[PDB]
Amino acid sequence: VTLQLRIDGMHCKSCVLNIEENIGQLLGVQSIQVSLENKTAQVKYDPSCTSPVALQRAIEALPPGNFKVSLTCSTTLIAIAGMTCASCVHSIEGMISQLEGVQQISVSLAEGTATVLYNPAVISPEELRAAIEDMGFEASVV
């Protein structure tokens, strides 16, 4: 995740260099970005080890107080060859959800693919395909 802050002393520009060198190699910060035309610094951080206040208190003590900041189940994937508009999603996700064993179903045109949580006692993947073929389209199990 991304955050924005202001700094005192970055007016001299070179202040940002010794910050940039140290910030981005650390357990909770993976890269650094600058926005000096906006007047801010832009940090690219991991919320697992750190947070806005913890970052603030870390980076402000890099210098000697010299640069100050202000802040029953299986899952399978399907490929489909009868999707011509986004309305195909609300049609497939709707109609295929009605034939039992289908616990959860999601579909996208971006790759032409669905992901579905099925009951392996009640239904098999090759039956999922057959239902889209019965709807009037074509499906394939990946």
CATH number for the domain harbouring residue 27: 3.30.70.100
Determine phi and psi for 140, rounding to 5 degrees. Answer: -140, 140
Provide the domain limits for residue 99: 72-142
Indicate if 77 and 135 belong to the same structural domain: yes
Residue 85, marked binder: yes
- Which element (helix H / strand E) includes 15? helix 15-22
Q: Which residues contact 89 (CB under 8 A, 6 or more apart)?
A: 83, 107, 108, 109
Indicate if 38 and 99 belong to the same structural domain: no
Indicate if 61 and 98 belong to the same structural domain: no
Contact yes or no for 24/32 (Cβ under 8 A): yes
* Phi-psi region at 118: left, alpha or beta (left = phi > 0; alpha = psi -120 to 50): beta
Indicate if 84 and 46 belong to the same structural domain: no
- Which element (helix H / strand E) includes 74? strand 74-80
Number of domains forming the structure of the chain: 2
Between strands 74-80 and 139-141, the pairing is antiparallel
- Six token digits for residue 61: 């003590």
Nearest by Cα to 101 from 82, 78, 83, 76: 76
Indicate if 78 and 111 belong to the same structural domain: yes
- Six token digits for residue 80: 């489909």
- Which element (helix H / strand E) includes 43? strand 40-45
Between strands 2-8 and 29-35, the pairing is unpaired
Look at residues 56, 71, 86 and tell me which one is the last residue of a structural domain: 71
Q: Based on the number of CB atoms within 10 Å of its own CB, is 114 exposed (0-12), middle (13-18) or buried (19 or more)? A: buried
- Which element (helix H / strand E) includes 116? strand 113-118
Look at residues 43, 71, 99 and tell me which one is the last residue of a structural domain: 71
Residue 73, marked binder: no
Indicate if 15 and 61 belong to the same structural domain: yes
Residue 15, marked binder: yes
Nearest by Cα to 117 from 87, 82, 80, 72: 72
Q: Which residues contact 55 (CB under 8 A, 6 or more apart)?
A: 3, 28, 29, 43, 45
Look at residues 24, 46, 71 and tell me which one is the last residue of a structural domain: 71
Q: How far is CA 86 from CA 22, 72, 98, in A?
A: 46, 31, 20
Indicate if 78 and 104 belong to the same structural domain: yes
Indicate if 67 and 84 belong to the same structural domain: no
Indicate if 9 and 66 belong to the same structural domain: yes
The three-state secondary structure class of 42 is strand
